Amino acid sequence: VWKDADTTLFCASDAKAYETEVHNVWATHACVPTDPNPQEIHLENVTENFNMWKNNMVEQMHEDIISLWDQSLQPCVKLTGGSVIKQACPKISFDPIPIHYCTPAGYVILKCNDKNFNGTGPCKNVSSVQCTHGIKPVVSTQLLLNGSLAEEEIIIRSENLTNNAKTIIVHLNKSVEINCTRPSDIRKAYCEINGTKWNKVLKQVTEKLKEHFNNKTIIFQPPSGGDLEITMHSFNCRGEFFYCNTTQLFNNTCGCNGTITLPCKIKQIINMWQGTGQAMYAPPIDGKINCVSNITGILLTRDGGANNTSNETFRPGGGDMRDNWRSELYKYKVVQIE
């Protein structure tokens, strides 16, 4: 028998002791080795209530990735609270590895196994684990990359679908590849996407949004302002910060069924996701830079004033990295064995 409780977690990883890669190096000194023989125990006659939007596991993983990034990414110049920090800025090797989050003695992790569980409310197929599965701390906006997929249906996850400032997390069941490259202006980059698969999955998601918003007309629109970090789909590829224009995906047109080519730029000055200010890095490395990533989720914000209007308007959201961890941690919760 158990009780809801918060506790300090510890991380586990398949990290290589001989790697120079920064994620491996952080987990070699901050995490344990993954359990060589994990045990999931299904708990019968048991229904449990979950809530991904009030889950302390998210804020603890957030804390970890903050610290991994400040130990691994060394910008030339940091501009925080008036201070201006000059540093060394060698190029690093960057490629995230899965992290597992594990309870200490006396506590345990309950797992929701309902395939169409939306994130809040009851779960009747519940298991028990000592560690979560392997989660990749991928930092990005608009699109959630290299994550896990919904088992059955596309799932809409939000704290309050009526609050328009409450972000929406769309969990796909079919991943779409995005192939982003800077070949051998050295900051010009691009991304290739199957419009065939994108527009079909996009149409499937607007069907899902009709269910939650009284059959109304779903309209996709580009971000209506902000810094480049949220107006573009931004991510780190091998240590370089990419900024990609995604208006061709957030578009209601679809003569369009081939490959979509998104324009991208590698930026050296960025607004940090940790909130601490600005940072400037060094020019990108020699040679072809290439990352192929799975799109497994979308982040969205709904427009306002349409209380009386016939349609609903959704634009690609992002910015708060806590929602990125929420999208992989939603099915877990820590409880104290009483």
Ligand X SMILES: CNCc1ccc2c(c1)C[C@H](CNC(=N)N)[C@H]2NC(=O)C(=O)Nc1ccc(Cl)c(F)c1
Query: Binding partner of residue 217 among ligand NAG, ligand X, none, CB under 5 to 8 Å per kind?
Result: none
Least distance (Å) between residue 91 CB and ligand NAG:
16
Least distance (Å) between residue 86 CB and ligand X:
20
**CA-based torsion, 147, 148, 152, 156: positive or negative:** negative
Least distance (Å) between residue 216 CB and ligand NAG:
9
Would you count residue 235 as binding ligand X (CB under 6 A)? yes
Angle, helices 22-30 vs 56-72, to 10°: value is 120
Would you count residue 320 as binding ligand X (CB under 6 A)? yes
Measured between alpha carbons, how far is 92 from 270 in angstroms, rounded to an integer? 17
Tokens of 94: 């960057």
Query: Binding partner of residue 197 among ligand X, ligand NAG, none, CB under 5 to 8 Å per kind?
Result: ligand NAG
How is 220-269 classified by DSSP, letter by letter? E----S--HHHHSEEEEETTEEEEE--TTTS-S-----SEEEEEEEEESE
Given candidates 28, 56, 194, 251, which one binds ligand NAG under the rule CB under 6 A? Answer: 194
Maximum Cα–Cα distance for the chain, whole Å?
63
Site residues for ligand X, window 205-234 (CB under 6 A)? 229-230, 234
Query: Binding partner of residue 162 among ligand NAG, ligand X, none, CB under 5 to 8 Å per kind?
Result: ligand NAG
Provide the 3-class DSSP secondary structure of residue 188. strand
Least distance (Å) between residue 65 CB and ligand NAG:
13
Least distance (Å) between residue 105 CB and ligand NAG:
26
Would you count residue 130 as binding ligand NAG (CB under 6 A)? no
Cβ-based nearer residue to ligand NAG, 194 or 278: 194
Residue in this structure with the two tokens 């607004």, named with its chain if needed: 271
Contact 296, 146 (CB under 8 A): yes
Measured between alpha carbons, how far is 186 from 225 in angstroms, rounded to an integer? 27
Given candidates 102, 108, 156, 202, which one binds ligand NAG under the rule CB under 6 A? Answer: 156
Contact 173, 194 (CB under 8 A): no
User: Of 37, 39, 33, which Cα lies nearest the Cα of 14?
Assistant: 33
Cβ-based nearer residue to ligand NAG, 194 or 274: 194
Given candidates 7, 51, 87, 163, which one binds ligand NAG under the rule CB under 6 A? Answer: 163
Would you count residue 197 as binding ligand NAG (CB under 6 A)? yes
Chain breaks after residues in the chain, where C lies over 2.5 Å from next N: 184, 254
Contact 297, 158 (CB under 8 A): no
Given candidates 34, 60, 140, 293, which one binds ligand X under the rule CB under 6 A? Answer: 140
Cβ-based nearer residue to ligand X, 312 or 323: 323
Site residues for ligand NAG, window 231-290 (CB under 6 A)? 231-232, 235, 237, 245, 247, 258-259
How is 54-79 classified by DSSP, letter by letter? G-HHHHHHHHHHHHHHHHH---SEEE
Chain positions contacting ligand X, by CB under 6 A: 139-141, 229-230, 234-236, 241, 270-273, 275, 319-320
Chain positions contacting ligand NAG, by CB under 6 A: 96, 113, 118, 120-121, 125, 138, 145-146, 153-154, 156, 158, 160-163, 173-175, 179, 181, 192, 194, 196-197, 204, 208, 214-215, 231-232, 235, 237, 245, 247, 258-259, 291-294
